[PDB]
Amino acid sequence: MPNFFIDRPIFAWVIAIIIMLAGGLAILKLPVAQYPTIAPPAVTISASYPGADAKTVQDTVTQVIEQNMNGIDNLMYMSSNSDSTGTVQITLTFESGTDADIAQVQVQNKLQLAMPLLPQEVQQQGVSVEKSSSSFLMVVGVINTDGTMTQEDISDYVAANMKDAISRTSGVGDVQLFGSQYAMRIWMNPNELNKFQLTPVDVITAIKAQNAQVAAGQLGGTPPVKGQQLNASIIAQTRLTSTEEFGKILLKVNQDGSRVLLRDVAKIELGGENYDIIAEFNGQPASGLGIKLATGANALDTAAAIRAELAKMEPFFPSGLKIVYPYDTTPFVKISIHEVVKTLVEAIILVFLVMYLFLQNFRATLIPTIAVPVVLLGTFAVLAAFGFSINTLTMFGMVLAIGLLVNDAIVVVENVERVMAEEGLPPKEATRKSMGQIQGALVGIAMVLSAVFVPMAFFGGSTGAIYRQFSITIVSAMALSVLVALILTPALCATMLKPIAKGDHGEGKKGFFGWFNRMFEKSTHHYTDSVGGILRSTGRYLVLYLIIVVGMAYLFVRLPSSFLPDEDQGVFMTMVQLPAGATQERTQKVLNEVTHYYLTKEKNNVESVFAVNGFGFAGRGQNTGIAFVSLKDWADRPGEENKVEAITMRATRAFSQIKDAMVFAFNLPAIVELGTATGFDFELIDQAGLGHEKLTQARNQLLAEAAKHPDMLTSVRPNGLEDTPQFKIDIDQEKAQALGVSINDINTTLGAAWGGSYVNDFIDRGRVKKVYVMSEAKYRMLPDDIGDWYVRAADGQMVPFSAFSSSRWEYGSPRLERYNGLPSMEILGQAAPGKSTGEAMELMEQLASKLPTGVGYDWTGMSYQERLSGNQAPSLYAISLIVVFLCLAALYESWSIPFSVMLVVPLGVIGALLAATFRGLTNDVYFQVGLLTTIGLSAKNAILIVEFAKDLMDKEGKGLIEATLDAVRMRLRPILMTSLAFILGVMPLVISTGAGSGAQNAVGTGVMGGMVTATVLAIFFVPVFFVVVRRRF
Amino acid sequence: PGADAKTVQDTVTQVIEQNMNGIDNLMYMSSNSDSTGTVQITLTFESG
Amino acid sequence: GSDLGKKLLEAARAGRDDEVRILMANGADVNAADVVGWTPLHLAAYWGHLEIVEVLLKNGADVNAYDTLGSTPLHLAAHFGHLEIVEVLLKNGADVNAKDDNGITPLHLAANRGHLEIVEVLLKYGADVNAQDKFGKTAFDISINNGNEDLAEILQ
Ligand SMILES: CCCCCCCCCCCCO[C@@H]1O[C@H](CO)[C@@H](O[C@H]2O[C@H](CO)[C@@H](O)[C@H](O)[C@H]2O)[C@H](O)[C@H]1O
Ligand SMILES: CCCCCCCCCCCCO[C@@H]1O[C@H](CO)[C@@H](O[C@H]2O[C@H](CO)[C@@H](O)[C@H](O)[C@H]2O)[C@H](O)[C@H]1O
Ligand SMILES: CN(C)c1ccc(O)c2c1C[C@H]1C[C@H]3[C@H](N(C)C)C(O)=C(C(N)=O)C(=O)[C@@]3(O)C(O)=C1C2=O
Incomplete structure (x- = not known):
């Protein structure tokens, strides 16, 4: 097949071109998003x-x-x-x-x-x-800056004149209004009502009657009198459209003929449907749209579409109204796609530099330049075929895979070059012979790399979905890479490379290169001498290897386990919490103070504070609030001091002394769609008829016991709210029946006045909208107001609410x-430092087993995913291990020689752990993806060493040491080039600060740490592995 | 029942239409609202 | 509202005895009250924390503090059937015949929930058996309206 295409370079071009076109087409049609589902x-x-x-x-x-x-x-x-x-x-x-x-x-x-x-x-x-379970593409804030519009005013404008056009914008799947459209607001006055012997019941009745759509029929409708000349619809009563009309609703005709109108017992106005949330944006009244990407859409196109639409609405905005963008996930997709391009560009340059530095001809330089882009393009085509998106995770796999394609490209061309120089064979004959030496191993390497990466796709739920993105990107890339290695690059080598005289190792050139060659030639002899003396004393190296293996064990164990590293996503949150019973106004003072802090003490980092009063994540209510803080670009926030972790920690400190409120800054989860994914998520369940109070006692009992084990559990706490004083009012049935007051009137009077009541709909400038009655605020604030409400009895007398009720404080x-389906209480917590969450879970289960009779429990969310995910891992690692071994045994026609390759795994893993530990990182998914690629690369280097060594014994009758030394000599240059290219190419991930740098740093410092130890150790150790394994069997 | 076309369009057709965004493979949507108070909204999807 | 006053309202509510002990040594206002006029004694009585009731009473808590609707700790203790707390409050001078804003008494509340021992304790400390709420009801009316025969027998 290499032989086939070496003789058919045009056919190989045709395949490469088809692959490129398929790749090109895929890029056009591929969904683009921040994350997969x-x-x-x-x-x-x-x-x-x-x-x-x-x-x-x-x-x-x-x-x-x-x-x-x-x-x-x-x-x-x-x-x-x-x-x-x-x-x-x-x-x-x-x-x-x-x-x-x-x-x-x-x-x-x-x-x-x-x-x-x-x-x-x-x-x-x-x-x-x-x-x-879907997340926001972006959030569009709509604010008014000239003091002319309330947040109600703004919400109504957005619903009436923006929301629908955004909903129709190409690529948007969902739009949510942060507020409501206007409602007709009838604010009742109990004094005015009583004055006329009226109640909210009368108000509701009059409204239902005088604001309505009434069917009539037709003039000359079928069946008609024959000879009828016109057929026409009859239009009768239709819905009210104005506050003026609602005010003019008729409630009562007094005996003197005078009229009681709705505006006589109430204040009428357009307003909100709800008044629980107060939204401000840098202190100004705000509304907004939460926008979600539609399935298969392109996030970048949708974002531009949205902004284009908003722009053409701008000319029609009232004064003071301004669009504002406090949350936009779209930068992250842009940064990601750019990284793929920037990485491809840098690799091409690095490969040029390294090929030329070692091989010193431009022609050899060109081949990888051609091969790598071809493989990368075709990789997009397979992603498409499999229904993947271009996203942050897949693109990140692309950057890693590019490192692997570079490796394949270099190895193929280098071997042709070595064979030419050593044998003096012409390009074509040498390409044939070279491919004959590596083709088997290339396929073996492809098999072995798949065995490593594919099983990770089979983790279930969330974890599998994340790994899937990497393993499918990476395994596709290297399946295509090998394919290009057997089809295109041999053709290119046989047709593009210049001949090399036998024995010509360039030691004769002058200048920098002549020097470098003589130096590298000398180094290769010093190297083989070393290995010769090493193989003269393999005993001590087995010892040193057990030391490495032991140290790996130790480093691995002590490395903290996390799922995903925090990121500086340009935005963070500030929880605000006031005691039970705390009012909306009090919460607003804290939010203001909080907003005043960021706009003042963080004026250089902070763009905006979006204060949401009345909203919390674990409970709404007048005493909870959130401030969403949006930052300037990572570029204007230089160094660690101005990144989110630093800002939040300073903010939480400054807010610590806020008097009667719990106020602290904290970061977003790395993937907002996925939720916190830290610690455990525990449900306490009322399994019998215990009831709320008894379940609270059981909760408290378990929380106290959790606190006695600070060594294993930290921050074990309720996710919910605590009981609060509530105002119990008992209607006395007897007294009501005796006064001739119906319960329905009483209860409707109480609830309409104090709770508000959705009567019906009206039409406001062509949009259907709700009508609400409720008491004006000042008549429904305190317990003494209760007696100001009056209900009309059957006999016409007005009866004060105090006459047939009684009240007391209680908790609820x-x-x-x-x-x-059962009463429950959610409990959050995490493992104390040094402990695993699984261990922390086992204790929680143990404390749970001592709770009062009939109290049960369950794990949910992350803990649910954690458990069923943790039960696969062993089976998946074993399957990987077994398949790698089987592939290698096939490759080498041997049950024992595979061992000499497999022994290299700790050699790279130790570097990764060392770099991670030193840099203070943790073992998370990106680190593990790094461990896998580290293993694969060291595996590849080992495989070709053993392949050459074995082939030399089999084909050329060379002795064990002779063959081993020769193999290791032949692989030194390709290993060094291949490692230099990769170390340089993965450098930017290691020092990266900014967008996604948490993930980048994780794989980067791991893969670079692993590549340094793997290439330094393997060149000495795998010769040892191969010798000792061969000897033993 | 009983609604003129503009009434049923304001209280019914627009209400439903404004919720018909972000459906997969939606090519186009047409509706009518008539004097018999009946509305018909048809959504047409990509050919496959 | 006090720093320690608030801490005490919470500790008493939660029945964190050792914390209440420390808070007493430190001078946390025993007369601290929340928005609805509840004291720590109110809270301890409601949730039935006996030792904290005793500790609060040793430390000058108003035994007859009323909330914004005129309810006392004896009302709460009687109502939620905490017999030993009821006894302690009475021994420390709780008004056995305290009327809340509704004219409701501790005897009313205890009878309404069928708490016979507490009703007996209250009668023993001189609970006015003929006391009427705002609707002219006695504890006895409550008993026969509830169809509680035992309770009725007790109140004759
Ligand atoms: C180059 C070619 C690459 C080929 C790579 C192929 C890898 C494909 C492996 C997928 C196999 C299924 O993956 C795994 O199967 C086993 C066996 O049923 C399941 O079942 C497992 O669950 C329980 C959990 O209590 C374990 O205790 C048990 O030992 C095991 O059977 C795992 O839950 C499942 O995740
Ligand atoms: C690209 C990475 C570049 C890394 C460069 C850094 C240098 C790393 C050196 C690795 C170790 C090789 O070092 C090698 O050790 C063995 C000892 O086992 C020496 O071997 C010598 O001593 C041993 C006993 O001590 C004798 O059995 C042997 O016959 C003798 O010649 C070699 O003379 C030496 O070259
Ligand atoms: C939680 N969130 C992003 C915000 C942010 C700023 C806001 O200004 C607002 C919200 C929540 C939304 C929810 C909407 C809801 N709906 C879309 C009409 C809603 O049902 C309610 C409700 N309490 O019933 C609101 O509070 C609400 O009217 C509201 O006033 C909001 C609001 O003002």
Whole structure:
């Protein structure tokens, strides 16, 4: 086949061209994104029940829906919380590989059939089913800078004039409004109401009557009187459209003929649907769009499309309105794609430098220049065939794979060059002979590298999804690389290389090169002399090898384990938390203070603070808040001092002394889609009829016991909220019945006034919008206001609420959690330093087993993934080991010689561990990907050494040492060139600071550490390995 | 039932259409809203 | 609101005895109250932490502190059936006949939840058996309305 194409260079070009075109086509059609899908598919059900406490939500919405989630396929687990903002979310998480569309439609269809079981007002609001395991492409902030628009004003503008056009923009899959469109707001006055013997019941009734769509019919409708001349639709009552009209609604005609209008008992205005969140952007009222990339779309094209659309909306903006971009994942895709290009460019240069430095002719220089791009292009084509995207992980695999293609290219051309110089054969004859020497091993190397990388694709869930990206990129690249090695590069060598006189090792040239050659020739003799003396004393080297192996064991064990290294993604968060009962205004003062800090003490690093009051991640409410901090580019934040970890740590310090609030900065997870992925995620479950209080006691019990083991567990804590004072009001049925007051009136009066009530819809400039009644703020603040509300009795008398009720303080939950249909409490924590999370989990299980009767537990999220992922690893590592050995045994026709290659693994792994430890890094996925490539490269060097050594004994009858020395002599130059090229080429990852540098640093310092020890040690040790193994058998 | 075309377009057609973004392989979408209060929204997808 | 006052409200609520002990030595306000007017004694009584009730009382806690709706710790202890706490409060001068803003008494609350021993303790300390809430109800009315025969027998 090499022989076939050496005689058919044009045919080989045709194959290369087809490969390039396939690659080129693939690049055009390939989806581009920051990440592949990594999280398991999750569907979320969201419901809202205006004015409802958490227990109400749970017991009339959440439990009913949960009880109907049956007959749905591939569900792993279900979880929910219900809280006192009137909100429930139920998340169902499905097995990896589940079709997210089927999962969603199955969930929504079960829900659809539970709707009739829900309260009316919850059916009115609607219940949404969505894929929630998707993440934001970007967030577009919309702010007003001239003090003319409230956040309500802005949200309505965005919904009316931006959201839909963005939704239609090419490549966007989903848009979310950070706020609501206007609602018609009727703010009732209990004094004015009582004054006319009216109640919210009357207000609601009048509104439902006087703001409505009424069907009529047709003039001359079918069936008609024959001879009828016109057919025309009758239009009767249609919905109100203005505050003026709502104000003019008729409530009562007094005896003196005077009229009570809605504007006489209420303030009417356009406003928000909800008032829980206050959003500011550098202190100014804000709204925005959360935008998600559509499947198979191009993130870069979508981003540009979005900005193009926004620009053409700009001319129509009211004054003060400004677009702003506090979150954009698109830089990361750009940086990634550029790195692939920059790496390819740098490698071509390095390969040129190293080929020329050693071989000293431009022609040999050209061959890798041609071969590497060809292999890389075709690699895109296989990614496409397999349905992968161009993304951060795949591209990162491309950069690594480029290092491998360089290696193949150099090895093939170098051997032709050596064979020419040593034998004086013409380019074509020498290419044939050279390919005959390596072709088998090249295929063996391809097999062995696959065996190393492919099994990692078979880790399940999240971990597999991440490794998959690397192993498929890398294994494709080197399958194509070998293919190009057997087809194109031999053809190129046989046709492009100039002849070398037998014996010509360039020692005769003058100048720098003549010097270098004589020097490298001398070095090769000193080297073989060394190996000769080494092989005269293999005993001590076995000892030194056990020392290396032992040291590897020690270094590996003590290296801290993490999944993904933090990144400086240009943005971070600041949690704000005020005590139970703390009000929205108080939270705002803290947010302001927080915003004032970043714009002041971080004026050189910070672009904006997006303060969100009323929102937290583990509980909403008036006393929680988040500040999203957006930074300037990594370029304007020089050095470690101005990177996120440094900024946050300084911020958390400065916020430590904030009086009555928990305020601290913290970084995003490395992959936002994937979530925290640190420590464990633990669910405590009410398995009997225990109830909330008894489950809290059991939780506290377990948390106290966790704290007694600081040596194994750290930061074991609830993910939820603590009970808070709530105001219990008891309606006295007897007194109501005796006064002639119906319960429905009482309860509707209380809830409409204090909780607010969604009456119906109206049409505002052609958009359908909600109508809400609720008391004006100052009549629903305190317990004494309760007695200012009056209900009309059957006999017409007005009865103060105080007449038929009583009240007391009690505690209750503002957020009840459930796990797989049972009451639950989520607990987070991590392993203490020096301990594994698995060990920390085992203790948690042990403390859990001592809890009161009927309290159970379960692992979820990361811990769920951790467990089932951890049970594969051994089987996958063994399969890899076995297959590598089988390939090698086939390659060498021997059950024992494979051992001499396999022994090289610690030689590179020790360097990786040493570099990682020194630089303070950890064992994470990028490090492990680095360990695999380190192993592969050292494996490759060892394989060709043993191949040559063995072939010399078999073919040329040479002795064990003779053959070994000769093999090691022949492989010195290619090993050095090949290692120099790679060390230089992977350098930028090691010193990189900025975008993705955490990942880059991880693979870089590992692969470079590993390459230094692997090439320095292997050139001395594998000659030893081969000799001792041969001797033993 | 009973709605004129502009009413049903404002309260129904636009409401549904504005949620029809980001569906895979959507080539185009056309709808009508009529005087009998009925609306029809047709979504046409890439040929395969 | 005190630094240690707040810490004490939490410790008492959580029943962290050793912490309360330290807090007492350090002078944490025993008369600290949250937004709804609850003291540590209120909290300890509600959640039934007996030792903390005793420690607070040794340290000058107002035994008859009322919250913003006029409820006392004896109300809470009686209502949630903490018998030994009820006894302790009474021994330390709790008003057995304290009325909250609703005219509700500890006897009302204990009868409403069917707490016979606590009702007996309260009657023993002179609970007014004829006391009426804002709706003219006595503990006895509650008993027969609840269909509690034992309780009714007790109140004659
Ligand atoms: C160059 C060619 C490259 C070829 C590389 C081919 C690698 C393909 C390997 C995939 C094999 C399946 O991968 C693995 O199979 C085993 C055996 O059923 C599974 O089952 C495993 O799970 C349990 C967990 O308690 C283990 O205790 C048990 O020893 C093992 O059977 C693993 O959970 C699965 O992840
Ligand atoms: C590209 C990487 C470049 C790395 C350059 C750094 C130098 C690394 C040297 C590696 C070690 C080789 O060193 C080699 O050791 C053996 C000892 O076992 C010596 O061997 C000598 O001593 C031993 C006993 O001590 C005798 O059995 C042997 O007959 C004798 O000649 C060799 O003379 C020496 O050359
Ligand atoms: C959480 N988040 C990104 C933000 C950021 C800034 C914001 O200004 C806002 C949000 C959440 C959104 C959710 C929306 C929601 N919806 C899209 C209409 C919603 O259902 C509610 C609700 N409480 O019911 C809101 O609070 C809400 O109206 C709101 O006011 C928001 C809002 O103002």
